[PDB]
Every structure is written in C-alpha cells, then in structure tokens.
C-alpha cells in the first residue's frame, strides 16, 4: 500500500536513504545534537535508526547520515 501524510505515521524499519547511506541512531549523541533546536512532533517515534518525519517535512521521511549541518537524507518510500 501507499504511505499517507508524507510518512508522518510511518512505523517501518527502513534505515537507509535513497542514495544508499546508512541511517544513524536518533539517540546517538551526534543526532541528538542536530535535533536539539528543531521542532519535532512528539507523536513521531524516533526509534533505532529508522527513517521518520518528525518535523513534518513535505518531502517525506528522512534520517541523519553524519553529525554536521545538512548531513541527512530522505528515504525511498511510496507515498499516496
């Protein structure tokens, strides 16, 4: 089936970006530092290193791939 609401309800386990980069754990120190000043929806569960869309990004789910600004990538999902 197709993923709705641009993945804001996604519970999957996809942990790699569209360009083949492995996702970092949301609980990792570098990830938390990048997330610190952003505005996330507490409803979205940042589990393991699975792709999620906590900020409501129009492009869809994504994940961090490193620890510097801009080090994130979107994940290949099928949206409705």
């Amino acid at each position: 089936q197709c993923v709705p609401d641009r993945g804001q309800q996604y519970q999957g386990r996809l942990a790699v970006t569209t360009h083949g980069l492995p996702c970092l754990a949301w609980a990792s120190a570098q990830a938390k530092a990048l997330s610190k000043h952003q505005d996330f929806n507490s409803a979205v569960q940042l589990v393991e290193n699975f792709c999620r869309n906590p900020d409501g990004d129009e492009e869809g789910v994504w994940c961090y791939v490193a620890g510097k600004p801009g080090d994130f990538g979107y994940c290949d999902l099928n949206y409705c």
């Binding site: 530092a33 990048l34 997330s35 610190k36 000043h37 952003q38 505005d39 900020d55 129009e58 492009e59 600004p69 801009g70 994130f72 990538g73």
Partner: protein, 274 residues
C-alpha cells in the same frame, strides 16, 4: 517581546523603526512603490539607497585578506542573520568559522571607511541550521552570528523586526511587494519586488522549492544573505520576511528567499540558549 533580552540583547521593542525616517515621520523615496503596481513595463532596476534607509544592513567580510562575502541583517544589538550557504558549502570546501570573519555595520558606501558612522565587529559564534540542505536545494538556508560585543545603535545602525504568525499571514502574500538591498555602484543598492505565487516559482526552475522558501521578481527574458523586508501598514514597522538565498535585477529575475517566519522557532531556541 518574543525574545528574552537577557540572551537576545536589546532592540526588539523598538525594532523596524528607522531613526532617519519613521522616527522623524518621514518616508523614503520609494516605499510608496511597495503599495503601487506599475504596468507600463518600466525596467525594474536597483537604484542608490538613501542615507539611513536600511540601518539593519550588515556586510559579512572575510577577515584576512579583507573581502566582501555576503550580506546579512541586524536583529538585535548582538545577533545577526544571514544565509547558511554564505558560511557553509561542502561542495566548494567552504566552511567559514567565527575567527575567519568580521562584520561591518551601518555602511552606505561599499568602498570607503565611513568614520563616525560604520562599526566593525568580530564574531563570538556562528550557528547553522542543522537541516540546512546543501546536498540538494539549499532548503533552510539560514544562519545566526553572535557578535563578540554588542553594537551601539545610531541614526545609521538599528535592528529590523522578525515577523510573528499574524504579520507573516498578512504581509507574505503573492502580489505584495518587498524590498531587497545589497551591493558597478559604490553605494548600497535597493530594489522592490513583488512576491510570486509558489506554482509560478516552481514552474521556473528544476530545483525543488519548499515551504521554507518563497520567491519574488519577474520572469527572465548576488546579494546573498541579505534581507527581503516589508513595511507593515498596521504598525509602521519594517519586518524581515526573507533572506536572499538563490536565484535581484532587471533582465528578468526570480529570486528565492529563506522564509524567515517558518524558521523562527529555530531562531528562538538558538538564542534562548547562547
């Protein structure tokens, strides 16, 4: 106030009211244009700014050798707003940090030292949006720079206001005009441009446009980091609605700007902390 003076510094309460204009109940020569729409096909080009017309204008310079790098804006007596790509862009091996830069505030002329007018300041720290998307489309192209020491306001140096939800809803609408300033003229150049509908902006480029951007200008046949401002007809204050990101002159030009209100939460969190 939206910000805490303890961390934000002074200036919010009196933001957006220029000492040489609003404070003297005077209007500059072209702000009337922000309310009128010409359809005579007149060429839209940058013209020389009036003295003290954009007191929040900030120039970002490479410390040594001295070289103008980008524009920026003063939002308080110690915080400056600019575009993230002006400081960080990995594809070009660009990664400017606080000690590699300096800012010049209150300037009118780009080429000479303005004694008893301009102020030069060093930076204490730079903050780049964690999800500034340099790998793809420059989404969230925004950065904050904290001054080493507070700058003193004057007739030539004064902070601009940042919009609230209500202000953004009322002013940032297709058709309304905004003003961009930047720097072969020797003085600060000004140009007023109309905001263009998202679908039309989209249609002009292959780059993915986001809700964190907006565009203005005219269809084709820079002052990156600088401000795109609008004057409120409701409180008479100037607000910075955008930051020149990519894409503001007269062949035919669509400029793209960082949607400041969309990123205000981030600004608040950063300042509320350092």
């Amino acid at each position: 106030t939206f910000f805490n003076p303890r961390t934000f510094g002074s200036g919010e309460a009196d933001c957006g009211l220029r000492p040489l204009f609003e404070k003297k109940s005077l209007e500059d020569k072209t702000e009337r244009e922000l309310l009128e729409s010409y359809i005579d096909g007149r060429i839209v080009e940058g013209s020389d700014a009036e003295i003290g017309m954009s007191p929040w204008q900030v120039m970002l310079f490479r410390k040594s050798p001295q070289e103008l790098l980008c524009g920026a804006s003063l939002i308080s007596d110690r915080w400056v707003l600019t575009a993230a790509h002006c400081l960080l862009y990995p594809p070009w091996d660009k990664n400017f940090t606080e000690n590699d830069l300096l800012v010049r505030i209150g300037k009118h002329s780009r080429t000479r030292y303005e004694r008893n007018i301009e102020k030069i300041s060093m930076l204490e720290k730079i903050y780049i949006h964690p999800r500034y998307n340099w790998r793809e489309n420059l989404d969230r192209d925004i950065a904050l720079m904290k001054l080493k020491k507070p700058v003193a306001f004057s007739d030539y140096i004064h902070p601009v206001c940042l919009p609230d939800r209500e202000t953004a809803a009322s002013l940032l609408q297709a058709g309304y005009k905004g003003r961009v300033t930047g720097w072969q003229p020797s003085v600060l150049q000004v140009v007023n441009l109309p905001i263009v509908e998202r679908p039309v902006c989209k249609d002009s480029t292959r780059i993915r446009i986001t809700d964190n951007m907006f565009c203005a200008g005219y269809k084709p046949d820079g002052d990156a980091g600088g401000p795109f401002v609008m004057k409120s007809p409701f409180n008479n204050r100037w607000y910075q609605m955008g930051i020149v990101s990519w894409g503001c002159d007269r062949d035919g030009k669509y400029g793209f700007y960082t949607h400041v209100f969309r990123l205000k939460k981030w600004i608040q969190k950063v300042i509320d902390q350092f």
